[PDB]
């Protein structure tokens, strides 16, 4: 009976491929052919935040466009005031192995995680003037890769045991589990409407989930290796993903197929982080060649190079109002560009 | 600059001072990454998802990390600055020796471990000696080249042993040393060792190997090489 089921699966995959091919009449390159290019952009560093004594792994911008949080291998979580380069809070971590960090939309909680398979939630605003551990969520089998706050009481996490989970902070237990991937889950990206999210894993595929229903809606496979970073278009009907094949790709949701690819012959290293601009015209990517690249999303041509780091670029973020870009790397320094 | 901004700057300066003190205090320990495939007794090498071990010798502190399913390449990038990687393999059996050799190939030629040295432990020597004296299993069944292998005439065997045990252990050590010197040039070296189930002294060997590694680094950075 296994052979019949395998044959049915193959036939269904062929039917899906034919259905996708039937919907491709024109390419994004041709439709955007007669569009004025953005020219050449040049960004200069404005603030250099120093004080970390180890490699920086992740960062997250605040909702007020002024405060940010950074995590490093030394075991410290540091809250930075971007305007004056002052340190607001320094939090020591129980485990020195950290892979992600998050900032609450309300601005009174932070999240951390790593190789301890535990998501730690810290409370910022409280009496007696100190930061205390508010919650320790456990239940994952592998290491956590990313975490994004949904509200003050719900969070979403992705782990290395090929799964994602939605956690209620007050109760401390999982309410929904997403299990569709076959490889390590590396990145997740939420949506502006807080109803859907995309996940990218090591099986060279991406999945679109439903927060309420809890079932996978669409899957996308167009990469030749594992994908490291995933983003989400401000419109909410597309996303972008970068892999260690020295290639980025833009994927649609309604057409359910790939749109455009960003790659060049001179780049052979992997891609660590991706992000979008306010209008979606600019796609910022971090590479292992100690450099950051800026791509035109509608034309697939480089328009700028950020070169200020002497080690591997790890984390990249764009401000909510689109006024600055924060990049952190393995040289214990994170910089702001404008 | 208002008074509140001045107070914030003072608080930031105090935070910086505490961070610098903590970083200075945390730099005096050596870090080692212990890993082994299976059935090698890596948990009993030093008698004294992350497992941590303390041990101190000659007023020097060592912190050993044991992480514990198939592809470890994703989480091995973090351990790109440790002092050494301790690889333990059980030489008593021969069915899964090729798996250990392939694992050593994968670890030695890692992209992120091009400047990290490996200390090799060949455990369960008593079982190997008992098996080779019994005469039941033969190496030639698994490795054909054992039939035509040069004897260790030049090298000096340990005082008191059968020549067959010496030949077998030298063949295994040569198999690991050749694959070690296959790539990596002089960027990183391997240090082979022979260990039994109950060995009183094992931290001294790690201490000596770390001393040699730090000596090589010092020679490199003192503008001498």
């Amino acid at each position: 009976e296994l052979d019949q089921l395998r044959q049915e699966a193959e036939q269904l995959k062929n039917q899906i491929r034919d259905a996708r091919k039937a919907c491709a009449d024109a390419t994004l390159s041709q439709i955007t052919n007669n569009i004025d290019p953005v020219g050449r952009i040049q960004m200069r560093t404005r603030r250099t935040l120093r004080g970390h004594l180890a490699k920086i792994y992740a960062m997250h911008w605040g909702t007020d466009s002024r405060l940010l949080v950074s995590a490093s291998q030394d075991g410290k979580l540091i809250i930075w005031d971007s305007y004056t380069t002052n340190k607001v809070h320094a939090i020591p971590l129980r485990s020195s192995w950290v892979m992600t960090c998050a900032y609450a939309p309300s601005g009174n909680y932070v999240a951390c995680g790593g190789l301890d398979n535990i998501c730690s939630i810290y409370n910022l605003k409280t009496r007696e003037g100190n930061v205390r551990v508010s919650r320790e969520l456990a239940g994952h089998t592998g290491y956590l890769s990313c975490c994004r706050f949904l509200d003050d009481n719900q969070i979403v996490t992705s782990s290395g045991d090929t799964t994602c989970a939605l956690w209620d902070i007050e109760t401390g237990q999982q309410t929904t589990t997403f299990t569709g991937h076959t490889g390590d889950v590396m990145s997740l990206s939420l949506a502006p409407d807080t109803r859907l999210f995309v996940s990218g894993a090591c099986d060279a595929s991406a999945k679109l989930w439903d927060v309420r229903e809890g079932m996978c809606r669409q899957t996308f496979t167009g990469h030749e290796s594992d994908i490291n970073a995933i983003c989400f278009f401000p419109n909410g009907n597309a996303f972008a993903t970068g892999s260690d094949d020295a290639t980025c790709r833009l994927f649609d949701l309604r057409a359910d197929q790939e749109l455009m690819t960003y790659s060049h012959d001179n780049i052979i290293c992997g891609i660590t982080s991706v992000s979008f601009s306010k209008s979606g015209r600019l796609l910022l990517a971090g590479y292992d060649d100690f450099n950051c690249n800026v791509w035109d999303a509608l034309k697939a041509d480089r328009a700028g190079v950020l070169a200020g780091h002497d080690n591997r670029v790890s984390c990249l973020g764009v401000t909510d109002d689109g006024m600055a870009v924060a990049t952190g790397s393995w040289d214990s320094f994170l910089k702001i560009w404008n | 600059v208002s008074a509140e901004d001045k107070a914030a700057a003072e608080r930031s300066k105090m935070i910086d001072k505490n961070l610098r003190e903590d970083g200075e205090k945390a730099r005096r320990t050596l870090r080692l990454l212990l890993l082994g495939a299976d059935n090698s007794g890596k948990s009993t090498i030093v008698k004294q998802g992350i497992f941590e071990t303390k041990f101190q010798v000659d007023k020097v502190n060592f912190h050993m990390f044991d992480v514990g399913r198939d592809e470890r390449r994703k989480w091995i990038q973090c351990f790109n600055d440790v002092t050494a990687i301790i690889f333990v393999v059980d030489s008593s059996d021969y069915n899964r020796l090729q798996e250990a050799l392939n694992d050593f190939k994968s670890i030695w030629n890692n992209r992120w471990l091009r400047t990290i040295s490996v200390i090799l432990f060949l455990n369960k020597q008593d079982l190997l000696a008992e098996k080779v004296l019994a005469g039941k299993s033969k190496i030639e069944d698994y490795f054909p080249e054992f039939a035509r292998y040069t004897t260790p005439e030049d090298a000096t065997p340990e005082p008191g042993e059968d020549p067959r045990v010496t030949r077998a252990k030298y063949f295994i050590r040569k198999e690991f040393v050749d694959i070690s010197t296959a790539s990596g040039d002089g960027r990183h070296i391997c240090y082979p060792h022979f260990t039994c189930a109950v060995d009183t002294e094992n931290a001294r060997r790690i201490f000596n190997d770390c001393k040699d590694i730090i000596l090589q680094m010092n020679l490199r950075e003192y503008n001498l090489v």
């Epitope: 405060l67 | 008074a3 509140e4 901004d5 107070a7 914030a8």
Partner: single-chain antibody, 229 residues
Amino acid sequence: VQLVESGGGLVQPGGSRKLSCSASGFAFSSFGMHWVRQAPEKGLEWVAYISSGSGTIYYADTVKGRFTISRDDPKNTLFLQMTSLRSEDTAMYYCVRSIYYYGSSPFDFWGQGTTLTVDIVMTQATSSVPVTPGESVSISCRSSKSLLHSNGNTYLYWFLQRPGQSPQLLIYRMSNLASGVPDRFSGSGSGTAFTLTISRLEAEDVGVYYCMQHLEYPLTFGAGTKLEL
């Protein structure tokens, strides 16, 4: 969070005294401290200030040269040493905590105080206003110079003192509402003209209201506005 003040009594002029403020319930080493005093039948006058880490000390011109500040962090205590006492030093002394970072709310907690017996001008035109429950009330405070800084922060603070109680913070930086305060309190205004508004007034809101400035030292208070039924 508790602050207890000790030291007081009848003192002959020219004597010396030592007042203590003991803290229990919060991280004392992370908070700067202030000593404030209130005359028997007058308003609030700033006296002295000690910083965290003892790196910055400020004194008032009236008590300069004869008042000393100290703090002990392991023992969690603040000391005020008084020498050459005069007849104008009879008052009630309050020990206040304050913390300074982006988004903090200084002057959040006040102590009970202890009794002792022997440049910018803030004006509150009104003195006493009759009020009734369920009626909106607006009180105004004026300043000699502009309290608005180039960074966009207007430094004005509001305090309420009930009969037989220590003052508590109501509004900081002229717009932000402190924790534990009902939403019926609001504050607004511009340079040298600020207004505090209370809607749906009810009991336990009677007392004396004070407006304070934090732009530059020394800190100065207002005369005070009294609300009576």
